Amino acid sequence: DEWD
Amino acid sequence: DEWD
Amino acid sequence: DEWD
Amino acid sequence: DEWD
């Protein structure tokens, strides 16, 4: 994941 | 090929 | 040194 | 050398 690149959001968190 | 590996034959020729 | 190579002794100690 | 570096000249010629």
Next chain:
Amino acid sequence: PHSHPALTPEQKKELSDIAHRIVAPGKGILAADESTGSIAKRLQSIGTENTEENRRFYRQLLLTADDRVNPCIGGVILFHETLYQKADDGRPFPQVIKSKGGVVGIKVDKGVVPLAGTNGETTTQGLDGLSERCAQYKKDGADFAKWRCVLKIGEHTPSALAIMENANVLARYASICQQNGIVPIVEPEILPDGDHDLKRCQYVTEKVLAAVYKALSDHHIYLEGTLLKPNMVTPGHACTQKYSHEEIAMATVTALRRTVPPAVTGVTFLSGGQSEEEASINLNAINKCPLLKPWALTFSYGRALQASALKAWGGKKENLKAAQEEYVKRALANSLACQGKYTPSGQASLFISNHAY
């Protein structure tokens, strides 16, 4: 010691023109290439069913936002699925993006895989049949690609192997993209996970980028036809030391100046876990850093550009206009930030508190 031109002048010009358009003054990149797995968590956070139509509507929401965003977006990164979907207006998303002045990008890596014999480190896969895929994506409107490698700062990491392997795979990917007219965005992301300080991050960033650019050179990569997507240099998320934005910018620009050849057309920062406002403030400070920066310093944000929009939308059709405007506002903010002209008028932490002790 003998040259075998990987690219012709025409090919170099094509690649260089694309890279420059993406990071033209005031322009950045919208990263909307979240996988069906990642996007699931997004839609889930707003109590929205993870359907193909919902993913299409959401991406539509962002991509078809008001034309006022046009000057802010030089490029949009899409996931495979989205590349082949269409907006309500009937046009395929790639065409929508181009009509708004944006270049289309496509994520091509296939995720990280573990490196045996290391303390939980990884490399990234996705090279198989990549040339053919790039050739097809090109035909379908894509002009740039995205490949993400992940490195972690820890007791014995990143290790020599992890640094060398990730740098090498990034170069292989870059080589394949340029052979197909695709500008490759090199992403050697160093995670902010950990309690390391700013200096540690700067050091690691410096060693990593040095390895990256040596690898690019070894593989005969055309730098002017590439972009770099690095992590900004910041303290670890659990660091107990407080820093100002100016320090983060100084550390970030210094690291870049010591490793990134002036030939690289642009740096499009990832924002990691930074808030929308934080990512803009740091990008602005980076651009205001009193040091010479020979490359464009802009953004390539996902969450930092969508957080408020996703929330304002909530899966409700009626919230469309309001939602789009939230994204438009972050776009305008970052457009200013990437030019060092973002300074909001007005006045101007758990691991910093005594609880972190």
Next chain:
Amino acid sequence: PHSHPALTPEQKKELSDIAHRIVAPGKGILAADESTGSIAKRLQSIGTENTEENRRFYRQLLLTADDRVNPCIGGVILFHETLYQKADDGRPFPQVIKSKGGVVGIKVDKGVVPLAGTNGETTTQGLDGLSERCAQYKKDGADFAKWRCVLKIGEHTPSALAIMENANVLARYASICQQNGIVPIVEPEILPDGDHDLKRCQYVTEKVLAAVYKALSDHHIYLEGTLLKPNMVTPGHACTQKYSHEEIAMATVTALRRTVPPAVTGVTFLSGGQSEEEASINLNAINKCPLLKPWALTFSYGRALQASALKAWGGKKENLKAAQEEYVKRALANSLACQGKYTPSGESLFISNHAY
């Protein structure tokens, strides 16, 4: 500088044991892993339509040769399709192989791809989803794998990039294999194409193998659980100088002694374009070379074991036995050769004045 055990003692023993079984004294490998694209040319050469039925019958013919090949064949490399086909009696091909004392191998690379900026050089692809593939293959009967990298001797080749990249990709492939109980056969083949002499081939081979073993070390590869499939050191096909088999052997063993750590369990030579006989005589000379060889020196032959068998068969069902006989004869010859006990009773255009 800190060790993070890639393999447990149990995992090591399994890999080492499999490796030793494949190259046990007198045993070699039958390379019957021709991809659908390669096998096509084979069937074509004998006017046979390339149908899954014919590919299966042909593979069945090789795998079911009488028990005389048992002590000769330690391993059999198969292509994906074949791994899941069955003999006429319904037995899965890998079971056929196991019942004859052989280890089942599976090719996992996906062919060579061009390296931009080089003079026609390549690297090899196939790492994507390889871990999951190896786990499935292990589960379905395979104990070792094959991955082929190709390098070429030329005016500016092999280049630094080609040597480094192929060495690195071989190391990635080997690491993933060992994580799934599969013994990786590292094949850094240097083609014989060109007019370079024996010394040139020996030099390039030494440089290539040195890079390969440095890379395996960087990637934490367990050498006792691997096998090497290199080219023998020979002059280029268009070389004008004449050499004896003893010289070819001395150059081959010397190159190996200078780069292949004693820990590597075995060396399974590829034969390239050599004739069936030639491949046997050279392997024999290699095993008779006076120098000390701390590893098994055997074969991993495709054409060198199948050439005559293919023609003898000619797609005819009734030629089954005669075709198998041709393979058996080569199996026995090379079993003797890998022990240095082969002594038979006995085309140099590039040596004649026509090459001047």
Next chain:
Amino acid sequence: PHSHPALTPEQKKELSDIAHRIVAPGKGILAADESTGSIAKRLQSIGTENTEENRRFYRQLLLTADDRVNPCIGGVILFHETLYQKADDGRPFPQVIKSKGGVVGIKVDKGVVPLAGTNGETTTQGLDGLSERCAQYKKDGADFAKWRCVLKIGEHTPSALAIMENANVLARYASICQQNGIVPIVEPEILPDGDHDLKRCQYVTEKVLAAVYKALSDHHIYLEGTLLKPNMVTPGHACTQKYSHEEIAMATVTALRRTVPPAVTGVTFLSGGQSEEEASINLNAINKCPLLKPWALTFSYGRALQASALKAWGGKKENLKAAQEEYVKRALANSLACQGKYTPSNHAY
């Protein structure tokens, strides 16, 4: 993966300030560090005998030129001998140099040595006791140093071994220098010898510099406290094709842009076998190149600044003024060139 600072903030500041002073706007470097074997050939070309006095006098001739050179010379590289000589007025040469606004430099390498197993390639020696020597040179007035590696373009050269070995030794040298307050000038000179064209030189220059900067990184070198002395990108001497100054400039600046980190304080070009005017014209063209150049682009000339002065002198004291005049003129010309402010001065078919 763990940082162990080779230098303190104060050390870095000193190194950075020195590097910047040397290549300040309009300033370049006078390379007067010819070895006795080379300076002997020089005096020989003018019928003058190679004596310590004649060598001292000639160096005095250059170092004591009129104050017009002061704004043109940011630094002077000396050979060990000269560093300890004195002017006719009794002042040590380093003192003379500094009073004229220049930083004193010292050549610390011990020449090239052959690399076995290669086609006439070499590496450079001089690391033994280099730390103690730098400490002494620093104490005696030197603030920067020079180390010359030589690579050659041919059928199989520069080889992987030569590139890697030379980049590595330059890194060792740079590391030892910065530990002793000395700013290292990194000189990975690719010889112009051969019939290769412009493209080939640019290709080789790019691979060599990429190796050099990777090595500097591996060895923890502080780039801001260093200078690069590379060859300009030009065709080989035996090349039949003649290129324009604009092409030489574009190829040179392009090679640098693709390999040299902007953190590098400056590039002080060697001129090789180029004539005085040629070296100035190309340096000027390089500074006029329509591409972003994040580092100072100046000179580190020996022959290209001395040729005419040497000839005019002819070993005759009676020609002191005339000789110094020739030097000052080249000094002035290159001061303008390192700013892109210089101007040169049918049968060509």
Next chain:
Amino acid sequence: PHSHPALTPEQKKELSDIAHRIVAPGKGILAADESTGSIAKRLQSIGTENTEENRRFYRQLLLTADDRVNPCIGGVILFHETLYQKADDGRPFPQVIKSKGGVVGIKVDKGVVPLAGTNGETTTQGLDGLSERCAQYKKDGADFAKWRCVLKIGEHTPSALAIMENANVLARYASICQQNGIVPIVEPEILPDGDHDLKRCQYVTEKVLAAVYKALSDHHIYLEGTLLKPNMVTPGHACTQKYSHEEIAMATVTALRRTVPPAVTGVTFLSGGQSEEEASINLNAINKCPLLKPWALTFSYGRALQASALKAWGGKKENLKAAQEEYVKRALANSLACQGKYTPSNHAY
């Protein structure tokens, strides 16, 4: 990708013959190359003034031991000074050694130097003018040389830089030696200092040796004409776990089997801080290890062959016979050990 023979068939044969003679069955090396500062500490331990005559006498004492050592000593490493000294009979020490069937070796490195940016790590110097030195040493009787690199096991060490640099410097030293007909003994010593265990030492040793052999390959080194002098694989001195000799042998042989090409003629182990007996027992165990060992596994002992001798001497000439007796005993012991035929002559709970 192009071969440029560093050596001719004749030069290779000479190096190969020399290497083989030094490690011939039952033979090992006497390391009597203590530096001026090192030998000073030796004589000091026995309350003996450190003068040249005492150093010469002591060396003579070892070099002139009775013929029983002849079949035990295939080589003797000397320090510069000793190479040019003579025994009481006027014979140069090199001649004394050859007369007893030993090959003469000379230490050519110039000590370790710190590597900036590392946690107390070092590389080694001594390359400057080494070619000329080797040529002279060859003329004066030396047929092999010694160069010592030091690596340390710690939290962040040995680092990538330390491993790469030391391996590269060893390769340079080896290349120069072979060009002058001198067999280079490559010594990448990994100190036993620290509290790491057997496994950590084995891991590090494997990484260091792989780097060493890749570097030797990159520099075109002729392995048949070299010897390797590595540390045996053992736990750190501060390690609380006591291992068996069978374990040390297994770990040591395994590490070598995974990194040292069979072409290497021999491995002459250093004993670090092991007692005389301990060094012999481990070497013996190493030679009885069930794994295939394609190279001679012998010794290159300094303290492990001199300890008791130096003690018996005490500086008294009247103890000459007693001292030499201690030396001989250890030579015989280790001569059996390198053949795996050596057997030394509830409170353990």
